[PDB]
Amino acid sequence: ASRSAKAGLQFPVGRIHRLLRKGNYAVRIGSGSAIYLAATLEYLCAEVLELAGNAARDNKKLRIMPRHIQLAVRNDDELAKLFEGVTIADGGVLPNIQSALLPKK
């Protein structure tokens, strides 16, 4: 059976494991390491996907639009402050307006 089932997870732990062997990082690879990294990736995908959809039904689409990923990463510090040098194809920019730009009153 699959360790992923034995881990209850979605990424192929043995596949990441071979990535490590042909990742040319260390000569020796502990087993649980791959599981642990897989769980990390589980979670990371979790926020990014969920909050993209969060934005998604906000302008009420049924499917994810890279607009929405772009916005999704914009509104959270913990994400953008993780993703500085990150530029997104067809991402666009978050809606920001500067105050003094506005008409006086």
Place of tokens 């990424």: 11
CA 56, CA 46: separation in Å to the nearest integer?
15
DSSP letter assigned to residue 62:
S
Which of 80, 51, 52 is closest to 64 using CA atoms? 52
Sites for its own copies among residues 12-51 (CB under 8 A): 24-27
Which of 94, 87, 97, 44 is closest to 67 using CA atoms? 94
- Which CB, 68 or 74, lies closer to DNA? 68
1 binding partner (options another protein, its own copies, DNA, none; Cβ < 5 to 8 Å by kind): DNA
- Which CB, 38 or 73, lies closer to DNA? 38
2 binding partner (options another protein, DNA, its own copies, none; Cβ < 5 to 8 Å by kind): DNA
Task: Give the shortest CB-35-to-another protein separation in angstroms.
Answer: 5
Which of 88, 96, 41 is closest to 69 using CA atoms? 88
105 binding partner (options another protein, its own copies, DNA, none; Cβ < 5 to 8 Å by kind): none
